[PDB]
Amino acid sequence: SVPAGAKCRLVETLPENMDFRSDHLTTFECFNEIITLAKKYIYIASFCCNPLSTTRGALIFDKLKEASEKGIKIIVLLDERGKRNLGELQSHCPDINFITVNIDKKNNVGLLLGCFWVSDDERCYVGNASFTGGSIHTIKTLGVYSDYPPLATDLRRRFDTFKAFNSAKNSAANLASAAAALPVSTAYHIKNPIGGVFFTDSPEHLLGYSRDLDTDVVIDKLKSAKTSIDIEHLAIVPTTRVDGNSYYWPDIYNSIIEAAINRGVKIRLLVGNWDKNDVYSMATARSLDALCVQNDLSVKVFTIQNNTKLLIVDDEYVHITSANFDGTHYQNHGFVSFNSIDKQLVSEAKKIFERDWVSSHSKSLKI
Amino acid sequence: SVPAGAKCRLVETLPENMDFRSDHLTTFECFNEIITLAKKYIYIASFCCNPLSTTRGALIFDKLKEASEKGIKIIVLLDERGKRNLGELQSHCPDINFITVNIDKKNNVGLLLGCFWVSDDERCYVGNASFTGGSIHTIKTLGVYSDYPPLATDLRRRFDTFKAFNSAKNSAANLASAAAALPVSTAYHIKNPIGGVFFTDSPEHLLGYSRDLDTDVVIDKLKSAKTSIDIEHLAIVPTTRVDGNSYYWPDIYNSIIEAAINRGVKIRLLVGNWDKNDVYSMATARSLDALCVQNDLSVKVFTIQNNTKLLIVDDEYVHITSANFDGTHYQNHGFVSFNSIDKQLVSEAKKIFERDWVSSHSKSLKI
Ligand SMILES: Cc1cc(C(=O)NNC(=O)c2ccncc2)ccc1Cl
């Protein structure tokens, strides 16, 4: 028999200067446990790589260095735009294989936002705590850890898909025929979850035929809401800025508004503060300001460094990712997202969101 | 050979108290010409019917009374909600057959917004000038008249489709089998226009299999814009209020924003003023206010009674209707809409929109 929740437990980074308290696992302890119990390999994937920025990050980097010295195959995937600290990394860990990934060389827009660890096809972590010192010590982060071998292997498959886009030599990022020969596989999705847990993936041109797009899954879970929608992301402006041009993408925006006005769903949005000079952010703010007073909608803003990307639907579905709900991310960036329906795990996630909502760092929206 | 523009000419109602001037045909003269040249029948369809409110409307009603007395079959279709003045109408014209229409008895939401005349399968008018004294004398209106027999017959087919929904006795508004036996036909659509002119129809459950939905046509013409979008409607709030519940429908709203931000289309919106107590209208206003200053978008408001529903795309497509661009109308109401691509007719429509844009009644948007 399979376990309920797939042996998944919540992990988060709560700095000392912040009032966030919980009995759950910390990202520091999580990475320590992943490295200690490692016997075959440790695969890590994120955007940037700079663990030495804080103390705990340096400690994790030292433990990983010891693991690589003992014979463990360490492979670290980071986007080619986080290539600044690369010369700093290889100088400290010559046995760790660092690989620059460019998942989109057609237009140079897609970015690698894996932000997950997998070890021995037995242990795994997935969240918004990248392999940096801030995401481990000073930046509040959220994610999930599991010692369930099948889930860890299904995440290792995503790591395999992402590794093939290395820049050096012909690979899936250079040749079309070699990229077409990528066994893009998945063992569990929304049509066949394991222990009430599955992985969604992004972007669309990297799914193959089996994997499920995170965009469609999130939009469906938002359109199928009946009771409550609780979102803690950075910002939900329907317009991003790619290069020097504004890009309009209101899919999640309009789905949430459809939930709020037509279906009257109690929605609470905890987002990061915005620049007063950005007219798009101010337009979004004053648009939601007239909707909070008309329908059952609440909005709070935070100013702290928080990478948390949490979605909770009807106290029955939970969705934790490393990408933010916007156009650029769900249209070009490549990432993996944890989705669960286990009532216990969703209840713990609801507890975390309730703690964050009434936190002192969550001031009410004022315009 | 077929004529260019399908013998169509612009018709409009410009009151004396307003500064609108044009050499085009007036709605009063248009109805006079339709009634005078009538030899077989005169079919009229609108929402409400109250011509005696003004002088010119009473004159048109008297001419129609004379036509009915001479033996012309006069049938007037009005929605069952405009049934107040019914006893006033039949008392003055006993020979005119007035019919109450309820196109939606399932939920009692759909309303008859035909707003067109057809005579002898030879002459026809279609616009936003209903069969009322205001739409002929005191309310600025817009529409098109044509003495082209095929176009008039294709509009008479729409009149036939709408007539079958009479309330008294079993008909297309009472029985399902009798409604299924409605020869819902059309001779021209966007895939086979005549002289660069075609009719779009609404709602979706009244199209059959041949007619084209006005919603899809308008959304496609807005998404396929490259140069300019000029809209003169009442309001473009993505939220209406049906009964005592708000209904969110941002399809046209989001298509226009997609045209403005992503494609940078120069868009000028001439809409009617809104209530300061309506939070949805204020939200829409302050949303567009931050977009006019960022992209090439301009907004002006008018306070006069104007039923004009004009859309102009790239100085190549023109769309004149009686319904307003919103959710309730294009989701439940039943109407017919004129669409043309003839460069001469679209140029005249652009002239009319330019005259209205710089008019004194068009004050710049201020918040
Ligand atoms: C491009 C953009 C578009 C919007 C937008 O679409 N605002 N519109 C409403 O918020 C609304 C108004 C009335 N009814 C329902 C919703 C907001 C911000 C931004 Cl940057």
Domain carrying residue A116: 4-364
Report the alpha-carbon distance of residue B250 to residue B238 in Å, rounded. 4
Report the alpha-carbon distance of residue A141 to residue B136 in Å, rounded. 66
Check CB contact of A292 with chain B, cutoff 8 Å: no
Secondary structure element (H or E) that encloses residue A171, with its range: none
Secondary structure element (H or E) that encloses residue A253, with its range: helix A251-261
Check CB contact of B293 with chain A, cutoff 8 Å: yes
User: Which residues in chain A touch residue B239, judged by CB atoms under 8 angstroms apart?
Assistant: 261
CATH number of residue A25's parent domain: 3.30.870.10
Ligand 1 atom 20: residue of nearest CA: A280
Report the alpha-carbon distance of residue B338 to residue B321 in Å, rounded. 6
Determine if ligand 1 sits within 6 Å of the CB of residue B287. yes
Interchain contact, A280 vs B293, CB within 8 Å: no
The experimental method, as deposited, was X-ray
SS3 A32: helix
Show the tokens assigned to B134.
Answer: 């205001």
Show the tokens assigned to A348.
Answer: 């713990």
Instruction: Tell how far the Cα of A182 is from the centroid of ligand 1, in angstroms.
Output: 41
Report the alpha-carbon distance of residue B126 to residue B330 in Å, rounded. 18
- B281 Cα distance to chain centroid: 23
Report the alpha-carbon distance of residue B333 to residue B325 in Å, rounded. 11
Q: How far apart are the first and last CA of chain A?
A: 53
Residue the block writes with tokens 């817009």:
B142
Instruction: Tell how far the Cα of A287 is from the centroid of ligand 1, in angstroms.
Output: 6
Q: Are strands A73-79 and A41-45 parallel, antiparallel or unpaired?
A: parallel
Report the alpha-carbon distance of residue A316 to residue A42 in Å, rounded. 32
Of A76, A70, A90, A13, the residue nearest A48 (C-alpha): A76
DSSP code, position B134: I
Report the alpha-carbon distance of residue A258 to residue A251 in Å, rounded. 10
Report the alpha-carbon distance of residue A193 to residue B327 in Å, rounded. 38
Alpha carbons within 13 A on the beta-carbon side of A162: 35
Of B103, B96, B115, B109, the residue nearest B47 (C-alpha): B115
Ligand 1 atom 17: residue of nearest CA: A284
Check CB contact of A289 with chain B, cutoff 8 Å: yes
Beta strands (DSSP E) in A81-238 are: 97-101, 116-119, 123-127, 141-146, 197-202, 228-232
Interchain contact, B247 vs A262, CB within 8 Å: yes
Burial class (CB in 10 A: 0-12, 13-18, 19+), A330: buried
Residue A33 φ/ψ, nearest 5 degrees:
-70, -35
Check CB contact of B291 with chain A, cutoff 8 Å: yes
User: Which residues in chain B touch residue A248, judged by CB atoms under 8 angstroms apart?
Assistant: 257-258, 261-262
Domain count, chain B: 1
- B159 Cα distance to chain centroid: 14
**DSSP secondary structure letters along B135-202:** IIIISBEEEEEE--HHHHHHHHHHHHHHHTTBSSSSSTTT-HHHHHT-----S-BTTB-BTTEEEEEE
Determine if ligand 1 sits within 6 Å of the CB of residue B257. yes
Interchain contact, B283 vs A289, CB within 8 Å: yes
Answer for the pair A47, A82: CB distance below 8 angstroms, yes or no: yes
Number of A–B residue contacts, CB under 8 Å: 58
DSSP code, position A130: -
Q: Report resolution in angstroms.
A: 3.8
